Amino acid sequence: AKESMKNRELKRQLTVAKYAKKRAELKAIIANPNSSAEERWNAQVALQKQPRDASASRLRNRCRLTGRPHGFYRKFGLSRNKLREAAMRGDVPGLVKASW
Amino acid sequence: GQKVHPNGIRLGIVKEHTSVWYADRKNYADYLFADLKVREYLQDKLKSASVSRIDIHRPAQTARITIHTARPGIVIGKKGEDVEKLRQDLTKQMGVPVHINIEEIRKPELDAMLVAQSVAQQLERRVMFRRAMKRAVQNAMRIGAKGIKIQVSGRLGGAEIARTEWYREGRVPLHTLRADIDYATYEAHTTYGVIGVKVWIFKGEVIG
Amino acid sequence: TQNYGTGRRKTATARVFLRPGTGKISINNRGLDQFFGRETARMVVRQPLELTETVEKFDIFVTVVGGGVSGQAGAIRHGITRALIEYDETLRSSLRKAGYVTRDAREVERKKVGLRKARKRPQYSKR
Amino acid sequence: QIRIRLKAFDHRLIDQSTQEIVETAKRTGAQVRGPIPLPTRKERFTVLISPHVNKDARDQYEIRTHKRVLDIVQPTDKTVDALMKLDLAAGVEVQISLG
Amino acid sequence: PRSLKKGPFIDLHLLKKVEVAVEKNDRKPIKTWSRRSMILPHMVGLTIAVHNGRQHVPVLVNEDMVGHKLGEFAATRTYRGHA
Amino acid sequence: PRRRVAAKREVLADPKYGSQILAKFMNHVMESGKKAVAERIVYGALDKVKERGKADPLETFEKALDAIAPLVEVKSRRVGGATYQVPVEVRPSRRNALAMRWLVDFARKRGEKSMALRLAGELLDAAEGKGAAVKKREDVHRMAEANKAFSH
RNA sequence: ACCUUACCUGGCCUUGACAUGCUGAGAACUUUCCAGAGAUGGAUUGGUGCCUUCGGGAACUCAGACACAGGUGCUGCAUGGCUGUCGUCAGCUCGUGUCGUGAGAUGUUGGGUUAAGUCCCGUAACGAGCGCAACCCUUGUCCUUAGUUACCAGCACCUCGGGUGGGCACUCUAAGGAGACUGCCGGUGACAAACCGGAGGAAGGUGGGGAUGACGUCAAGUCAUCAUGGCCCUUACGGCCAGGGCUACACACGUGCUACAAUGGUCGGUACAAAGGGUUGCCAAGCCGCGAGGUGGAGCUAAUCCCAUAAAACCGAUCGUAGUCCGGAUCGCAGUCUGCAACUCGACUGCGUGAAGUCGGAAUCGCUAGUAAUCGUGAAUCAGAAUGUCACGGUGAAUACGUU
Ligand SMILES: [Mg+2]
Ligand SMILES: [Mg+2]
Ligand SMILES: [Mg+2]
Ligand SMILES: [Mg+2]
Ligand SMILES: [Mg+2]
Ligand SMILES: [Mg+2]
Ligand SMILES: [Mg+2]
Ligand SMILES: [Mg+2]
Ligand SMILES: [Mg+2]
Ligand SMILES: [Mg+2]
Ligand SMILES: [Mg+2]
Ligand SMILES: [Mg+2]
Ligand SMILES: [Mg+2]
Ligand SMILES: [Mg+2]
Ligand SMILES: [Mg+2]
Ligand SMILES: [Mg+2]
Ligand SMILES: [Mg+2]
Ligand SMILES: [Mg+2]
Ligand SMILES: [Mg+2]
Ligand SMILES: [Mg+2]
Ligand SMILES: [Mg+2]
Ligand SMILES: [Mg+2]
Ligand SMILES: [Mg+2]
Secondary structure (H helix, E strand, C coil), X not given: CCHXXXXXXXXXXXXXXXXXXXXXXXXXXXXXXXXXXXXXXXXXXXXXHCCCCXXXXXXXCCCCCCCCCCCECCCCCCECCHHHHHHHHCCCCCXXXXXX | CCCCCHHHHCECCCECCCEECCCCCCCHHHHHHHHHHHHHHHHHHCCCCCEEEEEEECCCCCEEEEEEECCHHHHCCCCCHHHHHHHHHHHHHCCCCEEEEEEECCCHHHCHHHHHHHHHHHHHCCCCHHXXXXXXXXXXXXXXXXXXXXXXXXXXXXXXXXXXXXXXXXXXXXXXXXXXXXXXXXXXEECCEEEEEEEEEEEEECCC | CCEEEEEECCCCEEEEEEEECCCCCEECCEEHXXXXXXXXXXXXXXXXXXXXXXXXCEEEEEEEECCCHHHHHHHHHHHHHHHHHCCCCCCHHHHHHHCCCCCCCXXXXXXXXXXXXXXXXXXXXXX | CCXXXXXXXXXXXHHHHHHHHHHHHHHCCCEEEEEEEEEEEEEEEEEECCCCCCCCCEEEEEEEEEEEEEEEECCCCCCCCCCHHXXXXXXXXXXXXXX | CCCCCCCXXXXXXXXXXXXXXXXXXXXXXXXXXXXXXXXXXXXXXXXXXEECCCCEEEEECCHHHCCCECHHHCCCCCCCCCC | CCCCCCCCCCCCCCCCXXXXXXXXXXXXXXXXXXXXXXXXXXXXXXXXXXXXXXXXXXXXXXXXXXXXXXXXXXXXEECCCCEEEEXXXXXXXXXXHHHHHHHHXXXXXXXXXXXXXXXXXXXXXXXXXXXXXXXXXXXXXXXXXXXXXXXX
């Protein structure tokens, strides 16, 4: 949770969001059976030459407040522990301690 | 042992959420993040103004913010151009139009957050803690306030061994749930480190 | 005509209708024997009816939802007991002594944190 | 013949809103059938409370969603369409269909 | 193993460095850092120095091990022995 | 416990034979919560007993049980300096459970085709007392008799 | 697996990946190209832009200088906040009064009773506070409100599917409420508190479960979530990139799963649950493949559509106790899915081989009733990756003489 870690993961977010369609095009080309090796190999080369840091598998979502990688709940944008602080303060709407 | 958060365990029973609205998975995280940022920004800017509670109400594509403070003229100054510049500042945190309401609170010395901040700022000016805590308890007890407990922990004075002190008056029943215990925490950044302040105030028994 | 009753036991519910007839006994539009296969459900179901020697005099039409086979049998027993006591309101003490009217209250205890089951715990080596 | 759906985190506000809309719709003469409580949605979270290793110390939290259904017969006056600020105030979502 | 929709897999720089090496015969070992490359049957006879992690270990390729990846023949853990 | 407040829930769920002792034998023989399997096993053993012995299997089971029920047992006691064993008479209720437990435990390890004929053989053996369960009951009894010097 | 990532090898940056103050030049964009494992560098069609006191400004890209920025660097024995533990045990104190030269002690001791410092009466004590109990959630009974996407008693239609008309009967859903408070009876008891049975009652003795953790202890844990007093580096203890490691292996320990079979292994048809997730999503039908899977696209912003068929159970056929129609590790060959990429280092699929394992020493663990045992289902994290975690139901025990 350094400053550099947050900046350089914002880099991944930006690069992935900026293309966001060419990956879909190339994967549609590849996944389609009737595409021919002629139109498959060029798609392979296109995928290879494109920068590696523009993939969903390259993204690790962290806390929007501190950047803690582990303990993430995608329902919120919060880490494991700031969720507790926000809930106790009452900022999270509709959230109460449950017994049942 | 560790005590549960008095405000957390009373949510829904007698306490109320500060951020009251509705959303879904598309923008629940966005709305929550915007609320936390706007609260942080408001406190950081008008920390000088005695602000206690910030409520967020979000109808369709709009946000209505009500601010509780003890010094309304600080924000409503000469017809409140401060209000309009504040609105312009807030317009970017959440894209919806903003609406600001300033609420006055009677008896600022019966409010946990204001009392905690006052004690902390007295401590920052090298005032020894016993007199500050005693006078806070005195002022609170002199008007209603069927109970008050004040705790200060850390490197009290300047000794290089931290410790904890606390004074109570009246009754402060934490295990009961009918009670409405106002609770607040604050910090003081002195030359030797951080000193923490906690305040509990018991106002009455909620019947009905 | 007819009388109605409801029986619940272990997240199983059953609606029972008791009418004049010769005891066709239909369970979810199926015969009683064809529903419970080689178990103790039949006699425990008929226990309140066989205790009042009125096995055939009351045709019984029921529907049962939820739970398991034993739970369904218990629900039917309770429901038909209620339907009967909605017809013969002098045998209340009879089924109190028989112990058929009091509803079961035991339910599956939940799981807790730090435990595997509701009450089982790990081994706790002392070192 | 229109159908109205109401969603809220808290039941008190959804009850107040349902009473308000029922009163507004009945008072104008249009007929209304009674509300239907759709089953609530409960989502639970188990979270660690220690900053470091204490696995058994955990908190359970819950978010509840409440849904109500209303329907009308003989639509003659439509004022609640212009009363959106009345119907929804802070934390109730209203959907309308078959206008 | 990789799905058959993509038989081979070689980095583009490696391809353009070894596709040159087919018109003119094997004359110099190729220093490579890509351990994911799939050796095709039409580069048999060349010496490839694959990155171990400290240095590049050179290996010769014949037809027997064509159906294997590059780094598979370059280990990274020493294990000289417990005793 | 220390309270003596624990209740005694009564279970009597004989499906068709309507026997109380049979129900407790069911509860004893049941394993892993498999009631139906216990029902089939016990009823197969009972039917084998019937097809073998002309006497009705109810009384054969009863007389096997009454010939394996012990009267006294030996129990260890910490005297504070020695390892002593004292004989004590059985509580009237406990002997039934002891007989059931011994019977099922010895029946579980015959090595023949299935527990149907296993329990059949054990019931026939204990009807007059040639089974291993009766032998071990006699061994327990002779422990208790050889330790009669303490008695009390 | 890359990232995560904090370590190693190698290559590359010094106001720097980021913020503020100064000066100067200009759109970011898109240019689809080349050198290199890559950061990076170089050509690079096109438009100079918006508003002007039309002077300039904003914000963007880059360059230069310092004040700096930066650190998952040290100190938890300098700290805040957060957490474990004794322990959910019933204790811990104060004001006034009184006794003692004092440290202190009474209250808080006694006789009962209770889960309880719970209650009664006595009593130099009289009161009070934090604790216990209660107020909160869930489940078990009943009443009213309401009937859509939910239900179907009665009528009808019926292509025999709540399929339709329809109904407000029931179940069900969720809001508001009644009910259990030692309430009544018998016995005991200081005719007190309270104790042992009984009626009614769905539930009887805080009905069952959960949340709630007093004063304090262990210089207990955390500087690596965060914050923070110091101390430390500034061509690096700060940054960027590619590979490797955290998944190594003569051994030892903790926590689980699968077994060692006949209360079972297979084969055929057959029955009944609860809870939940889904519009950068679920992803059905038909069809193609032994299979993992592939085309295809319906419906669903979800009591409606999908995830998705529960299993154990019952019946019928077979195996006959044999390291076996048990057991599945290991291994060989060929596959499927996501991902840029399954060698180090993923999960599943087909064929085949098929191991240890005959219920396990000293020692040791959990559990008092829907409990133990056993069988299945869902969620989170997440491109893929659960024998782990959290949660939900099916079947369903034995035992408690008693306190040495
Ligand atoms: Mg930082
Ligand atoms: Mg990832
Ligand atoms: Mg449950
Ligand atoms: Mg279970
Ligand atoms: Mg051990
Ligand atoms: Mg790396
Ligand atoms: Mg410490
Ligand atoms: Mg600490
Ligand atoms: Mg004195
Ligand atoms: Mg003394
Ligand atoms: Mg003392
Ligand atoms: Mg003393
Ligand atoms: Mg004193
Ligand atoms: Mg005193
Ligand atoms: Mg004491
Ligand atoms: Mg004392
Ligand atoms: Mg008390
Ligand atoms: Mg309590
Ligand atoms: Mg706690
Ligand atoms: Mg320490
Ligand atoms: Mg340490
Ligand atoms: Mg590791
Ligand atoms: Mg217990």
